[PDB]
Amino acid sequence: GSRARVYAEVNSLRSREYWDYEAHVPSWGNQDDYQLVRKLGRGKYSEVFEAINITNNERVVVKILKPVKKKKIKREVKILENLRGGTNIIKLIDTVKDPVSKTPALVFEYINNTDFKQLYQILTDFDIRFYMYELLKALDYCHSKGIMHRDVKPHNVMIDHQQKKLRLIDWGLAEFYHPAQEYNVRVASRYFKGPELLVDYQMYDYSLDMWSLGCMLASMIFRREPFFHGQDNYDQLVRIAKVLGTEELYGYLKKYHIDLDPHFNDILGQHSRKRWENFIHSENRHLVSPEALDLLDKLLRYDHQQRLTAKEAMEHPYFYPVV
Template sequence: RDPVSKTPSLVFEHINNTDFKVLYTRLTDNDIRFYTLELLRALDYCHSNGVMHRDVKPHNVMIDHEKRQLRLIDWGLAEFYHPNQEYNVRVASRYFKGPELLVDLQTYDYSLDIWSLGCMFAGMIFRKEPFFHGRDNYDQLLKIARVLGTDELKRYLEKYDLELDSNFDPSLRAHIAAKPFSRFRNTDNRHLCPDEAIDLLSTLLRYDFQDRATAAEAMAHPYFDLVREERRVVEENADGNEVAISGSGSGSGFGMTTPPDAANTDALA
């Protein structure tokens, strides 16, 4: 509480964040794997506790690149999930809105956050930010359909007994062929989007929210094997240092390390 105004305040740790428009252009393949896995860990933690974030976007992901720390912030639109409950579709930011929000499907779930993460991931590996760049909500669905195609969109709408608003572009009712994600590779981004990255992306960006990978499933994808191997080596080296310190007779406890899965909350703010 402020001692003068008596206003209650929340105090958070300071994160030396680099603006994503600057940082994302500098990220290496390893960086993208690492930070995407960290964001999935944050989402897995909140989803496993019954919470949907509902506003995942670069502005709400703080990264201290020097310390390699990631924090998911701004929980103002977060909501507890209850099966079959109808939720407000006026959440998330346009470029990261899942199709369910754009077609007024109110019984969505945690996978809304997975779509938003998928948009971020696509933006990073293809160096195309934002990946789906619509002028408004109607145009946003058109931009999505030009990648995922209209055949799957029609099946999706039929499954949930939905009809497109008359304000949507008429071409959404015609045939638009799906465009493979691999078509977004070029000479400038090829080093950032190996086959396993494309495969992971295909599990995240799907019309039907029930078909998307969960955060836990995405974390287990082979794309992150390199990150897991790096962590294993670091932990083994840390364990070796602890043994050396213990054997020195110093009695110091500073060699102890935090177990990797004991701190999922570290990525939440």
């Protein structure tokens, strides 16, 4: 088995109503209070609009939830309510339904995001440190609140680059951490899935988010986006092993008594561990530093229990200029 090194017991120390989301009962308002002005984006679970609340003329975001089970809606809503006011966590403002279709929708505060494909190519070293530190504040907060995000990726991190403002959004895959609990491995986007998910290890914890955050750090400093570009869920593990090494993979499997599906033995091959300096070239040298590589090496580890916690990462020398 395995347990989180930090915040393991926090949910058991809280009232049951805090984490018993199935018992939560949203109050569904009328979406006709909201004028849908502009399509801001979309995801696997919703279409997202810039909206105006017609009663107070406040600009907001309305995420219309594609059909889905009520237990999943209760989970996302309760998590958002528990995290309301947390540093750099998107604020849930309202839960509404269209009066005719009855389709549910979540109303959030509005952030003027710059699309990451365009933003990431103009970031400086200092900018990357700044935004990674802001994202870490959000993750340490939710982890301290007993919640794993489970879908950390650039599309779920909103950044207003002119106001230096960041919000971690899209808590639809988030889940409460309880020690010993076995979780669904079908979470996160392929490129950001931790090795624990790709080898079907279900007793994971907040450290899954730190893998995803290291994936983002690597893409930002090295400019290879996504950094681990698997062609499918099996090749995803291969892409990781070609960097971290195969002997190190087997050591992790052995430690947690994980049986790797036999099909993997051929496609994995044998790969030495690579020095992170190997990914530096003329197009990214001005974003890479020894301190960035040290932090990266301590996040992208097979063993989830040895990865830095969010708070440990925040104390790393890479962030001294932004503390």
